[PDB]
Paper text:
[name] endonucleases are diverse enzymes that contain an eponymous motif consisting of a pair of conserved metal-coordinating histidine (H) separated by a bulky hydrophobic residue (U). Replication-initiating [name] endonucleases (Reps) are sequence-specific nucleases that cleave and rejoin single-stranded DNA ([name]) during rolling-circle replication. Replication initiator proteins (Reps) from this [name] endonuclease superfamily are found in a variety of bacterial plasmids and viral genomes, including circular Rep-encoding single-stranded DNA (CRESS-DNA) viruses that are known to infect organisms across all three domains of life (1–5). These enzymes initiate rolling-circle replication through sequence-specific processing of the viral single-stranded DNA ([name]) genome via cleavage and subsequent phosphotyrosine covalent linkage to the [name]’s newly exposed 5′ end. Following linkage, the genome’s freed 3′-OH can be used as a primer for DNA replication before its ultimate return to the active site, where it attacks the phosphotyrosine intermediate to rejoin and release the circular [name] genome.
To better understand the roles that coordinated divalent ions play in Rep function, we resolved two cocrystal structures of the endonuclease domain of DCV Rep in complex with a cognate [name] 10-mer (5′-TATTATTACC-3′) derived from the DCV Ori, with and without manganese coordinated in the active site. The substrate in both structures conforms to the characteristic “U”-shaped architecture, indicating that the [name] conformation is largely facilitated by the DNA binding interface and intramolecular base pairing and base stacking, with little support from the coordinated cation. In the DCV plus [name]+ structure, the [name]+ is coordinated by His52 and Gln54 within the HUQ motif along with the third residue of the coordinating triad Glu44, and a water, which, in turn, is positioned by Glu95. Two hydrogen bonds from the scissile phosphate complete the octahedral coordination of [name]+. A conserved Lys94 is oriented toward the catalytic residue and facilities a hydrogen bond with the scissile phosphate, adding evidence that this lysine may not only be a general base but that it might also play a cooperative structural role with the ion in stabilizing the [name] backbone in the active site. In further comparisons of these two structures, we noticed the [name] substrate seemed to be positioned much farther into the active site in the presence of [name]+. Considering that [name]+ coordination includes two ion-dipole bonds with the scissile phosphate, it is likely this is the driving force behind bringing the tyrosine in close proximity to the phosphate.
Author numbering: 4 to 106
Write the structure that this text describes.
Amino acid sequence: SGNYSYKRWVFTINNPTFEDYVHVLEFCTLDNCKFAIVGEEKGANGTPHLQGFLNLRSNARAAALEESLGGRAWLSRARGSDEDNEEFCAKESTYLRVGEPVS
DNA sequence: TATTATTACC
Ligand SMILES: [Ca+2]
Ligand SMILES: [Ca+2]
Ligand SMILES: [Mn+2]
């Protein structure tokens, strides 16, 4: 993963499988996260997807985070604030939330 | 980065 290692990440999982949901539920806990929010969403195409943000307690490299989330996620370092992500990932009103946004 | 996709924060 080179030096691409962060605590704060965005992720998307398109067409989540049952196993994707299990990995996300098992990982998005206070053990691992200061704050996490994951919304179940559909865009204009109607493709169901998980829309997620993680503020992790420890740095993760992409390969490790990929494994933790089930292996099918698009990942990138977060550029907005925790609150920006809390609003964005809650916008379709079917979501899981762990912890509180960190300023 | 790793990865499935038009979804992806600022
Ligand atoms: Ca970080
Ligand atoms: Ca499955
Ligand atoms: Mn979305």
